Amino acid sequence: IKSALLVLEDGTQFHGRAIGATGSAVGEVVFNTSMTGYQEILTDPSYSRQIVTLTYPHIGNVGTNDADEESSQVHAQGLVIRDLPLIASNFRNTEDLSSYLKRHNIVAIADIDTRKLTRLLREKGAQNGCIIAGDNPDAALALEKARAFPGLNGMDLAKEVTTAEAYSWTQGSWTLTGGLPEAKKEDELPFHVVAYDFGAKRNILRMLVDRGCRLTIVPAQTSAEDVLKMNPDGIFLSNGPGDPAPCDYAITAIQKFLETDIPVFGISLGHQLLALASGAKTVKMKFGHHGGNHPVKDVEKNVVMITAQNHGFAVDEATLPANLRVTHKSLFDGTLQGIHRTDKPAFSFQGHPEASPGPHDAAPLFDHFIELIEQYRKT
């Protein structure tokens, strides 16, 4: 018996078993509905400071592998599951989940009523929590830490996960037959996109590259100036953790780029930053959107796409400046999903066109970007 315990800000306790590292974990507790994709989830920087709860009971069926990592490390503060399978059973597995958690030093708990947990978050909204995995988990202690948690509202996490120094990326997408392909030669990529690293998932880069983009990844706080100097064919605003609002630097730079004719495209966080930079307002959702089955309607074309979502904040639709046009809304809740500048070649999407994990339905969002780029170069 290796005990683990999870306690929420509200006093609610979940007694289970330790499946990862010994220790404690404090963060915002979220629930994620994805039936497949747990590794990609965990490796998503957007999960920084969040304890992730998966609604699908069996987590770890396929083990883990390096191609399924969305970044260089495990970003989740902790993991909460109903059941860890006895074995991993997939030809692609390189290490069982538990071993993987131990290695990444992740505090994880299994064997708890995740549905209860989920219903609580839904009904009563996100809550901060603490997971304690060890010999005698002190519940009063857990309760303490949870309570002491600051909270993600107004918390800028982008700065914490951003790359120290710039760098180049020219690698494309994995294939069944070829796996993760070798990085391309710069000469092989037609365009040059400069990407703000607010905690970017590797698949975004991979997919842009697939589209002919050579990339330069920059720290979250890179200056527009320093950026404009590179002569980018396009500017990409990555996804990332925490409150987008406290990111004055980015908002400021973004505003600088908008005075220009350079194509701009943001995903999730970058979508909110764009919105802010355009004068919109962002809010923190009751519990957010985390899952891969979320219906999103493209209002112009009147079609629905099933998407991957990972967001705790949203852009208010009622506060939209006239220069921002609404391109997509959630079918689950009508919340704002996409916007396009009516005057500038700038647009964004709240969900994840790059999925990873999830439905490929929204991939085409990228395409528009390319188009913009191609046409920006025609000048």
């Binding site: 629930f31 509905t33 994805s34 039936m35 497949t36 994709g37 990609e40 609604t55 699908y56 009971p57 069996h58 069926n61 396929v62 592998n65 191609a67 399924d68 109903r82 059941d83 399978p85 006895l86 074995i87 059973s89 997939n90 030809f91 692609r92 009523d113 995740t114 549905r115 209860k116 989920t118 219903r119 839904r122 009904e123 994995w174 069944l176 899952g291 891969g292 089955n293 979320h294 219906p295 309607k297 009147n302 079609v303 629905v304 099933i306 079918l331 689950f332 999925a355 990873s356 994990p357 999830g358 439905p359 490929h360």
Partner: protein, 1058 residues
């Protein structure tokens, strides 16, 4: 775009009688569609020869046609109701096939009927295997190496190329009908001959083997706006090589990485797009090589299916309802999600927080000479479904819900058996129905997970779990009841262990384990199905039990409640009939204001549709599971008489545990069920019954027998012994003893008793004599040969029995009329399988009435007090599964083997029988040559049947003795050689298509075994045959009618009722 307005009326093609591979799922679907289209304001017309379906209930549609599902007949309905459109995707293969025939025949063109849901081309694209194959290569999807064949020669060449073993799959068939796996040339020719003949398009697809690869399915829904969703993914437990229908399956998929799952999800959408399904759902099947994720597309079914039903129950997403709507122009974004309170749209992919497991139900014990190994052709007769928070919990609950007597992983071989590993091994390597239990035996015997893997190809992910459960069992056995502390017990419960399984392991009574749980306050909690993994709230109470923290039951204190116990999985003898009853009890009581709670776990039924009741517990129908429900619901009453044997057997224990059982008492039930108790009652009643006697020993039997007199009905199975020597003979192979009433009419009587009066629901006279099970006999309502005088006697005896036995609700009484005397065969104090047919024939909803009676409202209070005698004839005929097990002698007897039935409505008996015969898929013709080969005792009446055939234009052949008898009466048939007599003989004559009709009656074990080749060939070569003289006469009468001449709707039929 919203609903279609260029359409007002819609014809829905129902599926027909239940058969292996095409079951209840279609009534669930048909009913969903009816409902959906009805709510949309369309006029609904439907055709279904199967009377035991909710979809044929008059109040479900506008024009209900219970007529043979033949294009000529359907044309008559069309021409007659002039529907604007036709929805052919809700009736299995029968609907697809009919749709295309109506199309082929110009019928649709003729009356301007628009095909909705799926187009004829769409259908053909998926149904024609060649077309399908071309379509996949065109979208860059991989298919097994294969070849198309339209003749044997072609076939052989494809084989020469793919090699053995190879997979044979007919075009235009499903459920593996006409297919199989050929491991050799011999098997190859047989299967091939079989499918070319069965294929509606005389075409086969022959593939190389992918046996052992992983098998996957995906349920897809697509709208005209091109919106597309995956409603559910299924991972099969049994590998490629064993039909999905006969496989243990689970949802959602378990062993695919997200990357592999997207590729498959993408492929699935591509396929519908390429095939052309634009407004509806479809099933797409795949094969995955576990070693490298290599994906292969296997097939696609352009309609709802058995999987779509499972899928709808698994997720809470009503696929068929949605589909019907889409078929009328609606788009997904426009429909609301039912279970989420309409809060979200139907355009989303469900996510579930539990594991769903389905286990097929077989009936091999009813088909002795049959090959009982699982293959690509379905052999299962039903299926159970279970929901659990974990796979182990899910699996185990399903095992206990299967109604095979298992309590979970009960052992099949003894630990001390020296040959155990060898038996285990074979069972593993060559799957049969019991494979699952053998897997657990293997672990007890010392086989490793890798060892088991190697033989079964079942993914280790599942195997390790079973192994872990075995190890848990060993601990239980070791620590005994003493070791059953709270923690351990909780642990065991969380893993799905039944109190019964634990009791056996700890060598105590089940009640002891239960009690212990009570002590520890160890009870399950209930979770609800919601399509979204708790992301949104639900206003529906579709629940399942699990051992966890939070309970979502929130039972009302408001309403008086009534619990209806279902029958679990369908099996031969326990079909949809019993479910139709459960449904009607629920609908009626709810309408009456009670809060209705349904307890069932059959994924194919309307009873397990959340719409059917106020609250649904999708649980195994067991004492353990029921008591837990009761424990928290505290209902006013519980109905155990409507679900078949399953709930019937729990009756006593339920009451004993203080459950409030309504209707006929558990004691009363036993009085009727216990032969002895029954014999006294009869006696006390001064009623006639065959002479009988329990014989212990052999010799005690040969003497008693003398007493009783031959022939004898040896019920321990069932057999008819004709002579002393037969007795010992049987005994050798082999106790109640009963004089077999030879040359008797069998009669069934359905009735209701309210304690005050008895209402005769219907007197049905069987066509086949006593001795051929009633479940396998065609029958007529009203009787077609019984005198009123004698029926009046039966009516009086039913009443005498009703009052004496204390019946309260339904009852069914069976007689044998011999020499103007009534004899009693048995009393079934509960809803019988004839209840739907009678209700349909008479317009009276017996199950609705009897359910009200049981709940407390008298027959007088309801205004249902007089027996109804329709102005037309109602004939019920059955469908038998022999074609699925060609090694079995296709003859009728005292044991039931039929899977379903159809109803025929006529102005006359001949007319009803003709429509019933046709509806049953009879290949009977009105010309040709008939072969007569009858038993001694029939030789006399044969003459007349022979005259009849003659006057009809038939030519005749006959075997020796029969010919001798005809000649003497002036009839000279053409003599035919018996197989041993020389050549040519009947087999040759049959094989060479010389006959269009066969009448062959036999008597005696030896004589039967000998004549086996006639029946077998007849069935093989598709020649209509009767195995009873009584049946021959009936067939003869129908020769005089025309089943396509006139059609009538249920509403019209019921209006004619005065």
């Amino acid at each position: 775009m919203p609903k279609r307005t260029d359409i007002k009326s819609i014809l829905i093609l129902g599926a027909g009688p239940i058969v292996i591979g095409q079951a209840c799922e279609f009534d669930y679907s048909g009913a969903q569609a009816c409902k959906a289209l009805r709510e949309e304001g369309y006029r609904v017309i439907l055709v279904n020869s199967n009377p035991a379906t909710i979809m044929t209930d008059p109040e479900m549609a506008d024009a209900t046609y219970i007529e043979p599902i033949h294009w000529e007949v359907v044309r008559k309905i069309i021409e007659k109701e002039r529907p604007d459109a036709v929805l052919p995707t809700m009736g299995g293969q029968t609907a697809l096939n009919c749709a295309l025939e109506l199309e082929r025949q110009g019928v649709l063109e003729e009356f301007g009927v628009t095909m909705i849901g799926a187009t004829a081309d769409a259908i053909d694209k998926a149904e024609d295997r060649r077309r399908f194959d071309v379509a996949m290569k065109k979208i860059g999807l991989e298919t097994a190496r294969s070849g198309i064949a339209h003749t044997m020669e072609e076939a052989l060449a494809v084989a020469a190329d793919v090699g053995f073993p190879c997979i044979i799959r007919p075009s235009f068939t499903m459920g593996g009908s006409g297919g199989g796996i050929a491991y050799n040339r011999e098997e190859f020719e047989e299967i091939c001959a079989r499918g070319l003949d069965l294929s509606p398009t005389k075409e086969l697809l022959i593939d190389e083997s992918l046996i052992g690869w992983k098998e996957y399915e995906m349920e897809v829904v697509r709208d005209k706006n091109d919106n597309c969703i995956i409603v559910c993914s299924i991972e099969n437990f049994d590998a490629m090589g064993i039909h999905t229908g006969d496989s243990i399956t689970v949802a959602p998929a378990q062993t695919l990485t997200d990357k592999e799952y997207q590729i498959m999800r993408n492929a699935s959408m591509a396929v519908l797009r390429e095939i052309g399904v634009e407004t509806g759902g479809s099933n797409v099947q795949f094969a995955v090589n576990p070693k490298n994720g290599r994906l292969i597309v296997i097939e696609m079914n352009p309609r709802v299916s058995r999987s779509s039903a499972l899928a709808s129950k698994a997720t809470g997403f009503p696929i068929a309802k949605v589909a019907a709507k889409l078929a009328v122009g609606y788009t997904l974004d426009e429909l609301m999600n039912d279970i989420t309170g309409g809060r979200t749209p139907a355009s989303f992919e469900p996510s579930i927080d539990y594991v769903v497991t389905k286990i097929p139900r077989f009936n091999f014990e009813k088909f002795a000479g049959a090959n009982d190994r699982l293959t690509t052709q379905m052999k299962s007769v039903g299926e159970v479904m279970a929901i659990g928070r974990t796979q182990q919990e899910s699996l185990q609950k399903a095992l206990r819900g299967l109604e095979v007597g298992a309590t979970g992983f009960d052992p099949k071989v003894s630990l001390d058996d020296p040959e155990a590993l060898t038996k285990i091994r074979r069972e593993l390597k060559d799957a049969g129905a019991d494979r699952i239990w053998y897997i657990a035996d293997a672990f007890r015997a010392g086989l490793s997970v890798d060892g088991v893997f190697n033989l079964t190809n079942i993914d280790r992910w599942f195997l390790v779990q079973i192994e872990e459960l075995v190890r848990l069992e060993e601990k239980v056995a070791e620590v005994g009841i003493t070791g059953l502390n709270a923690d351990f017990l909780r642990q065991l419960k969380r893993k799905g262990f039944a109190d019964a399984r634990l009791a056996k392991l700890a060598g105590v009574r089940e009640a002891e384990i239960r009690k212990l749980r009570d002590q520890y306050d160890l009870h399950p909690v209930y979770k609800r199905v919601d399509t979204c993994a708790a992301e949104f709230a639900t206003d529906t109470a579709y629940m399942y039990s699990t051992y966890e923290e939070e309970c979502e039951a929130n039972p009302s204190t408001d309403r008086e409640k009534i619990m209806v116990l279902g029958g679990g999985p369908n099996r031969i003898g326990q079909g949809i009939e019993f479910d139709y009853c459960c449904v009607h009890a629920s609908l009626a009581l709810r309408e009456d204001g009670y809060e209705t709670i349904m307890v069932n776990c059959n994924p194919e039924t309307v009873s397990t549709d959340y719409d059917t009741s106020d609250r649904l517990y999708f649980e195994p129908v067991t004492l353990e599971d029921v008591l837990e429900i009761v424990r928290i619901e505290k209902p006013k009453g519980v109905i155990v008489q409507y679900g078949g044997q399953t709930p019937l057997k729990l009756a006593r224990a339920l009451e004993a545990a203080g459950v409030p059982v309504i209707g006929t008492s558990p004691d009363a039930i036993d009085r009727a069920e216990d032969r002895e108790r029954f014999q006294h009652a009869v006696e006390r009643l001064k009623l006639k019954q065959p002479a009988n006697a329990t014989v212990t020993a052999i010799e005690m039997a040969v003497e008693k027998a003398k007493e009783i007199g031959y022939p004898l009905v040896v019920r321990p199975a069932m057999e008819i012994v004709y002579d002393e020597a037969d007795l010992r003979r049987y005994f050798q192979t082999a106790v109640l003893l009963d004089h077999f009433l030879d040359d008797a009419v069998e009669v069934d009587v359905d009735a209701i008793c309210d304690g005050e009066m008895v209402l005769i629901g219907g007197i049905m006279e069987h066509i086949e004599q006593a001795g051929v099970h009633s479940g396998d006999s065609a029958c007529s309502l009203p009787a077609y040969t019984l005198s009123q005088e004698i029926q009046d006697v039966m009516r009086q005896q039913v009443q005498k029995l009703a009052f004496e036995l204390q019946v309260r609700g339904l009852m069914n009484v069976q007689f044998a009329v011999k020499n103007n005397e009534v004899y009693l065969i048995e009393v079934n104090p509960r809803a019988a399988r004839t209840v739907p047919f009678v209700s349909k024939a008479t317009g009276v909803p017996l199950a609705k009435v009897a359910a009200r009676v049981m709940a407390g409202k008298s027959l007088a209070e309801q205004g249902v007090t007089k027996e109804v005698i329709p102005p037309y004839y109602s004939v019920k005929e059955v469908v038998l599964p022999f074609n699925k097990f060609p090694g079995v002698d296709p003859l009728l007897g005292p044991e039931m083997r039929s899977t379903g039935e159809v109803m025929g409505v006529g102005r006359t008996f001949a007319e009803a029988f003709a429509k019933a015969q046709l509806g049953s898929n009879s290949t009977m013709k009105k010309h040709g040559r008939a072969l007569l080969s009858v038993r001694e005792g029939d030789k006399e009446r044969v003459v007349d049947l022979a005259a009849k055939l003659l006057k009809q234009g038939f030519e005749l052949d006959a075997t020796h003795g029969t010919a001798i008898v005809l000649g003497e009466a002036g009839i000279n048939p053409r003599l035919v050689n018996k197989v041993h007599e020389g050549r040519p003989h009947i087999q040759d004559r049959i094989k060479n298509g010389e006959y269009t009709y066969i009448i062959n009656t036999t008597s005696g074990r030896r004589a039967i075994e000998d004549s086996r080749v006639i029946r077998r060939s007849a069935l093989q070569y598709k020649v209509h045959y009767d195995t009873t003289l009584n049946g021959g006469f009936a067939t003869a009468m129908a020769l005089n009618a025309d089943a396509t001449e006139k059609v009538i709707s249920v509403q019209e039929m019921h209006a004619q009722i005065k």
